[PDB]
């Protein structure tokens, strides 16, 4: 599924991401835009052999099991394919564990390089939330 901007904002708000660990909703929408272009089916391989999955590009090195990242962890206790679903619940619940691990949203390279320090509230402007 490719989400609309306000559609994703509403769904992230319903799942409790608005101001989760102090990150306003615009941060999460900005992150998803530059990680996946709002596409739940996005995948990208990393140099170390791990792969990033889904709308928030969650990495198989630490967070999910994809059967092909030997010596990795599965801290969200899910198969990585669950992160590709049109239902974003698994992505959001895993994202909550990531952002709580000490580094905040700096865990997402695209957020730090393209969202941090900008007017992220612009990403939810015009949405009925
Ligand atoms: Na893994």
From Swiss-Prot:
Indicate the residues that form the catalytic site. Answer: 35, 52
Q: Which coarse location class applies to the principal site listed for this UniProt protein?
A: secreted
Could you tell me what this protein is called? Lysozyme C
List other remarks: Lysozyme C is capable of both hydrolysis and transglycosylation; it also shows a slight esterase activity. It acts rapidly on both peptide-substituted and unsubstituted peptidoglycan, and slowly on chitin oligosaccharides.
Instruction: Quickly give the catalysed reaction.
Output: Hydrolysis of (1->4)-beta-linkages between N-acetylmuramic acid and N-acetyl-D-glucosamine residues in a peptidoglycan and between N-acetyl-D-glucosamine residues in chitodextrins
Q: What is the lineage of its organism?
A: Eukaryota, Metazoa, Chordata, Craniata, Vertebrata
What is the protein's quaternary organization? Monomer.
What is an example of a GO molecular function annotated in this UniProt entry?
A: beta-N-acetylglucosaminidase activity
What family name appears in the similarity comment? Belongs to the glycosyl hydrolase 22 family.
| Record InterPro entries | Glyco_hydro_22, Glyco_hydro_22_CS, Glyco_hydro_22_lys, Lysozyme-like_dom_sf
Q: Which Gene3D superfamilies match?
A: 1.10.530.10
An example of a Gene Ontology cellular component annotation for this protein is: endoplasmic reticulum
> So where does substrate get bound?
101
């Amino acid at each position: 599924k490719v989400f609309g901007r306000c559609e994703l904002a509403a769904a992230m708000k319903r799942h409790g991401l608005d101001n989760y660990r102090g990150y306003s909703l615009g941060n999460w929408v900005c992150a998803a835009k530059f990680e996946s272009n709002f596409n739940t089916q996005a995948t990208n391989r990393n140099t170390d052999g791990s792969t990033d999955y889904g709308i928030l590009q969650i990495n198989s090195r630490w967070w999910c099991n994809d059967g092909r990242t030997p010596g990795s962890r599965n801290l969200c206790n899910i198969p990585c394919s669950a992160l590709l679903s049109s239902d974003i619940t698994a992505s959001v619940n895993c994202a909550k564990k990531i952002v709580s691990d000490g580094n905040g949203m700096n865990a997402w390279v695209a957020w730090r390089n393209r969202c941090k320090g900008t007017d992220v509230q612009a990403w939810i402007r015009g949405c009925r939330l």
